[PDB]
Amino acid sequence: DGAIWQWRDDRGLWHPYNRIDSRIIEAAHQVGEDEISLSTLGRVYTIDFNSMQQINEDTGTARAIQRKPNPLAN
Ligand SMILES: Nc1ncnc2c1ncn2[C@@H]1O[C@H](COP(=O)(O)OP(=O)(O)OP(=O)(O)O)[C@@H](O)[C@H]1O
């Protein structure tokens, strides 16, 4: 839980992923995965670390993602 990942909405604001989704993204990022799949809200997303984007695999919409360190000690 060393990171808080965020995604960018259409109006340009950043939203934190939930703790579990941040954990999933972070774990894949840490080991050098190129991409992972994430399901939330019944939607299927590819998290593409080569381009640092979240891609909706049905609509083709790509959104920026970014990582913030989590200060909180285990
Ligand atoms: N990781 C996420 N968690 C929650 N909401 C998200 C996430 N990514 C996108 N959204 C929101 O979900 C909606 C759909 O975004 P998404 O990128 O899935 O597809 P889209 O092609 O923009 O939209 P639509 O399905 O309406 O054509 C938008 O309101 C967007 O801000």
PDB file of C-alpha atoms and ligand atoms in Angstrom:
ATOM      1  CA  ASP A   1       0.000   0.000   0.000  1.00  0.00           C
ATOM      2  CA  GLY A   2       2.993   2.240  -0.753  1.00  0.00           C
ATOM      3  CA  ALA A   3       1.210   4.218  -3.517  1.00  0.00           C
ATOM      4  CA  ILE A   4      -1.948   6.128  -4.318  1.00  0.00           C
ATOM      5  CA  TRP A   5      -2.748   5.904  -8.043  1.00  0.00           C
ATOM      6  CA  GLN A   6      -5.048   8.415  -9.726  1.00  0.00           C
ATOM      7  CA  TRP A   7      -6.934   8.645 -13.048  1.00  0.00           C
ATOM      8  CA  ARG A   8      -7.899  11.803 -14.965  1.00  0.00           C
ATOM      9  CA  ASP A   9     -11.558  12.640 -15.714  1.00  0.00           C
ATOM     10  CA  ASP A  10     -12.849  14.369 -18.826  1.00  0.00           C
ATOM     11  CA  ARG A  11     -12.785  17.778 -17.079  1.00  0.00           C
ATOM     12  CA  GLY A  12      -9.131  17.297 -16.212  1.00  0.00           C
ATOM     13  CA  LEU A  13      -9.392  16.493 -12.483  1.00  0.00           C
ATOM     14  CA  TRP A  14      -7.606  13.633 -10.764  1.00  0.00           C
ATOM     15  CA  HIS A  15      -9.457  10.928  -8.866  1.00  0.00           C
ATOM     16  CA  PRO A  16      -7.833   8.374  -6.526  1.00  0.00           C
ATOM     17  CA  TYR A  17      -8.411   4.719  -7.366  1.00  0.00           C
ATOM     18  CA  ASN A  18      -9.813   2.800  -4.380  1.00  0.00           C
ATOM     19  CA  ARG A  19      -7.232   1.174  -2.040  1.00  0.00           C
ATOM     20  CA  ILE A  20      -7.600  -2.262  -3.627  1.00  0.00           C
ATOM     21  CA  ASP A  21      -7.326  -0.942  -7.187  1.00  0.00           C
ATOM     22  CA  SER A  22      -4.291   1.205  -6.244  1.00  0.00           C
ATOM     23  CA  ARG A  23      -2.764  -1.941  -4.663  1.00  0.00           C
ATOM     24  CA  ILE A  24      -3.391  -3.949  -7.861  1.00  0.00           C
ATOM     25  CA  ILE A  25      -1.902  -1.237 -10.081  1.00  0.00           C
ATOM     26  CA  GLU A  26       1.059  -0.632  -7.761  1.00  0.00           C
ATOM     27  CA  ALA A  27       1.955  -4.317  -7.494  1.00  0.00           C
ATOM     28  CA  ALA A  28       2.053  -4.709 -11.272  1.00  0.00           C
ATOM     29  CA  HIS A  29       3.998  -1.482 -11.711  1.00  0.00           C
ATOM     30  CA  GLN A  30       6.556  -2.516  -9.092  1.00  0.00           C
ATOM     31  CA  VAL A  31       7.471  -5.747 -10.954  1.00  0.00           C
ATOM     32  CA  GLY A  32       7.689  -4.094 -14.399  1.00  0.00           C
ATOM     33  CA  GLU A  33       4.461  -5.428 -15.960  1.00  0.00           C
ATOM     34  CA  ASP A  34       3.641  -3.618 -19.211  1.00  0.00           C
ATOM     35  CA  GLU A  35      -0.103  -3.776 -18.563  1.00  0.00           C
ATOM     36  CA  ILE A  36      -2.796  -5.255 -16.398  1.00  0.00           C
ATOM     37  CA  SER A  37      -6.558  -5.624 -16.555  1.00  0.00           C
ATOM     38  CA  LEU A  38      -8.764  -4.019 -13.903  1.00  0.00           C
ATOM     39  CA  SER A  39     -12.549  -4.358 -13.531  1.00  0.00           C
ATOM     40  CA  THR A  40     -14.532  -1.692 -11.713  1.00  0.00           C
ATOM     41  CA  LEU A  41     -18.211  -0.690 -12.026  1.00  0.00           C
ATOM     42  CA  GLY A  42     -18.740  -3.543 -14.473  1.00  0.00           C
ATOM     43  CA  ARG A  43     -16.297  -1.937 -16.880  1.00  0.00           C
ATOM     44  CA  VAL A  44     -13.094  -3.504 -18.111  1.00  0.00           C
ATOM     45  CA  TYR A  45      -9.960  -1.381 -18.195  1.00  0.00           C
ATOM     46  CA  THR A  46      -6.450  -2.001 -19.341  1.00  0.00           C
ATOM     47  CA  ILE A  47      -3.837  -0.164 -17.301  1.00  0.00           C
ATOM     48  CA  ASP A  48      -1.009   0.445 -19.791  1.00  0.00           C
ATOM     49  CA  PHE A  49       2.208   1.440 -18.052  1.00  0.00           C
ATOM     50  CA  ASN A  50       4.101   1.965 -21.330  1.00  0.00           C
ATOM     51  CA  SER A  51       1.841   4.945 -22.067  1.00  0.00           C
ATOM     52  CA  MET A  52       0.701   5.626 -18.449  1.00  0.00           C
ATOM     53  CA  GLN A  53      -2.958   5.404 -19.378  1.00  0.00           C
ATOM     54  CA  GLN A  54      -6.173   3.663 -18.385  1.00  0.00           C
ATOM     55  CA  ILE A  55      -7.926   2.346 -21.516  1.00  0.00           C
ATOM     56  CA  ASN A  56     -11.601   1.369 -21.717  1.00  0.00           C
ATOM     57  CA  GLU A  57     -11.426  -1.711 -23.913  1.00  0.00           C
ATOM     58  CA  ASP A  58     -15.031  -1.317 -25.137  1.00  0.00           C
ATOM     59  CA  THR A  59     -15.044   2.408 -26.080  1.00  0.00           C
ATOM     60  CA  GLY A  60     -11.330   2.971 -26.777  1.00  0.00           C
ATOM     61  CA  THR A  61     -11.210   5.953 -24.387  1.00  0.00           C
ATOM     62  CA  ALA A  62      -7.732   6.482 -22.914  1.00  0.00           C
ATOM     63  CA  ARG A  63      -7.200   8.516 -19.698  1.00  0.00           C
ATOM     64  CA  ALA A  64      -3.991   9.614 -17.990  1.00  0.00           C
ATOM     65  CA  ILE A  65      -2.934   7.938 -14.739  1.00  0.00           C
ATOM     66  CA  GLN A  66      -0.358   9.019 -12.190  1.00  0.00           C
ATOM     67  CA  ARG A  67       1.216   7.765  -8.965  1.00  0.00           C
ATOM     68  CA  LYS A  68       1.622   9.552  -5.645  1.00  0.00           C
ATOM     69  CA  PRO A  69       3.669   8.039  -2.791  1.00  0.00           C
ATOM     70  CA  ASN A  70       1.684   7.067   0.295  1.00  0.00           C
ATOM     71  CA  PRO A  71       3.385   8.511   3.446  1.00  0.00           C
ATOM     72  CA  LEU A  72       1.472   6.192   5.774  1.00  0.00           C
ATOM     73  CA  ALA A  73       3.645   3.638   7.534  1.00  0.00           C
ATOM     74  CA  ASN A  74       2.495  -0.001   7.555  1.00  0.00           C
TER      75      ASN A  74
HETATM   76  N1  LIG B   1     -11.236   4.182 -12.892  1.00  0.00           N
HETATM   77  C1  LIG B   1     -12.437   4.774 -12.919  1.00  0.00           C
HETATM   78  N2  LIG B   1     -13.203   4.732 -11.801  1.00  0.00           N
HETATM   79  C2  LIG B   1     -14.406   5.332 -11.823  1.00  0.00           C
HETATM   80  N3  LIG B   1     -14.960   6.066 -12.782  1.00  0.00           N
HETATM   81  C3  LIG B   1     -14.166   6.102 -13.869  1.00  0.00           C
HETATM   82  C4  LIG B   1     -12.929   5.504 -14.017  1.00  0.00           C
HETATM   83  N4  LIG B   1     -12.423   5.776 -15.275  1.00  0.00           N
HETATM   84  C5  LIG B   1     -13.351   6.503 -15.867  1.00  0.00           C
HETATM   85  N5  LIG B   1     -14.401   6.778 -15.042  1.00  0.00           N
HETATM   86  C6  LIG B   1     -15.634   7.526 -15.353  1.00  0.00           C
HETATM   87  O1  LIG B   1     -16.518   6.609 -15.930  1.00  0.00           O
HETATM   88  C7  LIG B   1     -17.195   7.228 -17.050  1.00  0.00           C
HETATM   89  C8  LIG B   1     -16.853   6.464 -18.302  1.00  0.00           C
HETATM   90  O2  LIG B   1     -15.453   6.643 -18.596  1.00  0.00           O
HETATM   91  P1  LIG B   1     -14.653   5.594 -19.496  1.00  0.00           P
HETATM   92  O3  LIG B   1     -13.254   6.108 -19.645  1.00  0.00           O
HETATM   93  O4  LIG B   1     -14.889   4.230 -18.963  1.00  0.00           O
HETATM   94  O5  LIG B   1     -15.418   5.566 -20.895  1.00  0.00           O
HETATM   95  P2  LIG B   1     -15.886   6.657 -21.945  1.00  0.00           P
HETATM   96  O6  LIG B   1     -15.606   6.124 -23.309  1.00  0.00           O
HETATM   97  O7  LIG B   1     -15.384   8.006 -21.547  1.00  0.00           O
HETATM   98  O8  LIG B   1     -17.438   6.716 -21.643  1.00  0.00           O
HETATM   99  P3  LIG B   1     -18.796   6.084 -22.100  1.00  0.00           P
HETATM  100  O9  LIG B   1     -18.797   4.654 -21.639  1.00  0.00           O
HETATM  101  O10 LIG B   1     -19.862   6.921 -21.453  1.00  0.00           O
HETATM  102  O11 LIG B   1     -18.843   6.216 -23.627  1.00  0.00           O
HETATM  103  C9  LIG B   1     -16.807   8.713 -17.018  1.00  0.00           C
HETATM  104  O12 LIG B   1     -17.723   9.470 -16.238  1.00  0.00           O
HETATM  105  C10 LIG B   1     -15.434   8.660 -16.359  1.00  0.00           C
HETATM  106  O13 LIG B   1     -15.058   9.868 -15.722  1.00  0.00           O
END
